[PDB]
Design a protein around this ligand. Sequence first.
Ligand SMILES: C[C@@H]1O[C@@H](O[C@@H]2[C@@H](O[C@H]3O[C@H](CO)[C@H](O)[C@H](O)[C@H]3O)[C@@H](O)[C@@H](CO)O[C@@H]2O)[C@@H](O)[C@H](O)[C@@H]1O
Lengths: 307, 315
Amino acid sequence: SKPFTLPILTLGELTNSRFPLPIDVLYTNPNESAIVQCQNGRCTLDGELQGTTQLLPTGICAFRGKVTQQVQDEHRGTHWNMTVTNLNGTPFDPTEDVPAPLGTPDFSGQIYGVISQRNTLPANRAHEAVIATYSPKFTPKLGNIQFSTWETQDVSSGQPTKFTPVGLASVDANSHFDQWTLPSYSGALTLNMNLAPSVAPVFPGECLLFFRSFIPLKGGYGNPAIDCLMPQEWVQHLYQESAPSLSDVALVRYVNPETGRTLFEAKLHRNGFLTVARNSAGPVVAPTNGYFRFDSWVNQFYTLAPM
Amino acid sequence: SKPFTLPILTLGELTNSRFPLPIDVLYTNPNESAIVQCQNGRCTLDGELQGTTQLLPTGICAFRGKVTQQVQDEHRGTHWNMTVTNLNGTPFDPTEDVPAPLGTPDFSGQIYGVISQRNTNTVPGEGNLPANRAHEAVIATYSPKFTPKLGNIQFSTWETQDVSSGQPTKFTPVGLASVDANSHFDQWTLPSYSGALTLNMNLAPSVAPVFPGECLLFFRSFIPLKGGYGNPAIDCLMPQEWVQHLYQESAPSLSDVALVRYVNPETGRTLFEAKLHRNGFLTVARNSAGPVVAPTNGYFRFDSWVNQFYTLAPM
Ligand SMILES: C[C@@H]1O[C@@H](O[C@@H]2[C@@H](O[C@H]3O[C@H](CO)[C@H](O)[C@H](O)[C@H]3O)[C@@H](O)[C@@H](CO)O[C@@H]2O)[C@@H](O)[C@H](O)[C@@H]1O
């Protein structure tokens, strides 16, 4: 049986699977009331990608497509309707068993980035843009979204268009940032489909452990973060290896290689997420040289050493 | 001896190691007159990172630091000086044996992206949260003010005032501002990391075919443009996932050349073969420039260690 492994990458060598950001800290929040059911950075321990998860770091919260129409918003700014394809350029087939094109953002908010176009030497243009994923016009599962620009006219219809995500536009009350609220991929009255399952601890005293990244803001006050269940390099590693899962729960140790000492241990669950025995919220303070090492297969009743 | 391996990733599952872009096509250009000596995407087959290469896809052509002040520059736009640290936030130590902070761009051009800031100081009335701002920015890596090895660079903005002094600053690369003649885009011309008239140091070595009939094989990505005409590309020697894989594995190199086959897994058939050289680059037996037109399911598979005199089957 092909032995299970994790990459040997320290926190400072890992990136977020839910937004193109480095991992900044490990993080817990035991009193979280939301159902945690993110769709990017989802991969089983035996290498099955789930939700909208794909392998490219460049594909996370990316879109590819063509602009079809300009619409002016009542207040301020210009909106552009965009028909989206798969990230590899092939037509998105809504009948495929995915929630949305792979790479589609998996949270409610105003995602800030750059729209760029290269016409079919060709002419080019790029502008700052915002995609409101909570918008009724955000319907990637139906093959179309809307983005807004400060630019009022210089966006071309019928030309190949790329969205490069950069951060959030805002996290103020009216910007509906909630990292655990899924978009309605087909619009507000339609049920999301083919989702990666929710994740949660099942053992008393345990809480989820997240890989946290701080995300840039176009403006306003805030220090927003995006928490992923596993970094993108773990998704890539699990996918490559496809090691059989020998129980539902792997025991992993967070080790300081310079001392060889275990800093803490965690459960790595079959569906691809971590729990720890910790009764507090906040970052995990751990040496920079640290990384997770697979120890053994255990079960749901294994008692983790308290952090 | 730990066996050498490559990841099993098709072209559509690979990203560029010199700019945050997917790999679009494999590419050759036998008649290239430039010395090929890029500094990102440099890793030996036994896992030694070289040049300015680091592991994070988010770190490639990124900067982290602090704006010091707005500055006057001859060229169009509003200009800003920014100190740069290592990407992990620690001070960059110029005495380290690297050309520049890891992640620094390794080509001449106007690199377009977004500068964002999150203030250090927080406001009680805003729930003890910091103020933020982001704007488009351009870094001209050929500028005499581009001195990342000295811990300082300059960027320009269309925005005329809303960039804060003394605040933590991130550059997220997006593409190029221009490839007009006056924007000096040349993917094989290195920046002067310490400024005009200084010799770059600690470089990853140049790469070249040594065997007649062979040429370099590149992983090519098309890079976005803020404006103007063009279809610019960035060619890397190995994709970022190969850098990450080689670094993990650190398998001993058993000769100077690994024979690899580009395989179509749907047929199991070899489409062509290539030499994967110890220093971390590919050559093929091809006598033309341009894309390699190959089925989308394709990937390289390690076959055996050979020697420099191995004759490749013509592509
Ligand atoms: C907290 C504040 O956030 C950002 O300002 C925005 C405002 O942005 C507008 O004004 C600023 C200058 O004040 C700048 O010109 C920016 O380009 C422009 O769009 C505006 O969005 C208001 C709307 O209520 O919110 C914030 O004040 C940022 O630019 C500021 O530097 C500052 O960090």
